[PDB]
Design a protein around this ligand. Structure first.
Ligand SMILES: Nc1nc2c([nH]c(=O)n2[C@H]2C[C@H](O)[C@@H](COP(=O)(O)O)O2)c(=O)[nH]1
Ligand SMILES: [Mg+2]
Length: 129
């Protein structure tokens, strides 16, 4: 069968709000309010897959780790796996290569609408809260 993995993480900061890449003052799309963790799949392990993206989507040296939640669902042969890593802190500024630089925003009320629907499955459950 065919499978496809994805890993994502909310970058926590001092303020306790997590820097989510969104808008970025006139960018490609305002619906890109997502976080690092794109291309972890490739051919690594559930852990060693994101570990490589973690630095690729942050670049800096942040106290980032742990898994807040992961969405596991398998479609007609083509299965999908989304692993969310609960980040705690980040030194300097996050760069890596996730997307359009975002601002430190409170995760207490993340918006699945303003963010890519590709990750809505997991965020939906919480966002709906
Ligand atoms: N249609 C299609 N989408 C895929 C495949 N593999 C794969 O990771 N994806 C998806 C799932 C991920 O959310 C995202 C990761 O970045 P890419 O699109 O660049 O591979 O794309 C695939 O073989 N076919
Ligand atoms: Mg990547």
């Amino acid at each position: 069968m065919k499978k496809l993995q994805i890993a994502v993480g909310i970058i926590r900061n001092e303020n306790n709000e997590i820097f989510i890449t969104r808008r970025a003052a006139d960018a490609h799309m305002a619906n890109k309010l997502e976080f690092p963790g794109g291309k972890i799949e490739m051919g690594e392990t559930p852990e060693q897959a994101v570990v490589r993206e973690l630095q690729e989507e942050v670049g800096i040296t942040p106290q980032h780790f742990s898994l807040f939640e992961k969405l596991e669902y398998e479609f007609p042969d083509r299965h999908i796996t989304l692993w969310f890593w609960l980040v705690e802190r980040w030194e300097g500024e996050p760069w890596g290569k996730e997307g359009q630089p975002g601002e430190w925003m409170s995760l207490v009320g993340l918006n699945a609408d303003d963010f890519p629907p590709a990750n809505e499955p997991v965020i939906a459950k919480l966002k709906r809260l």
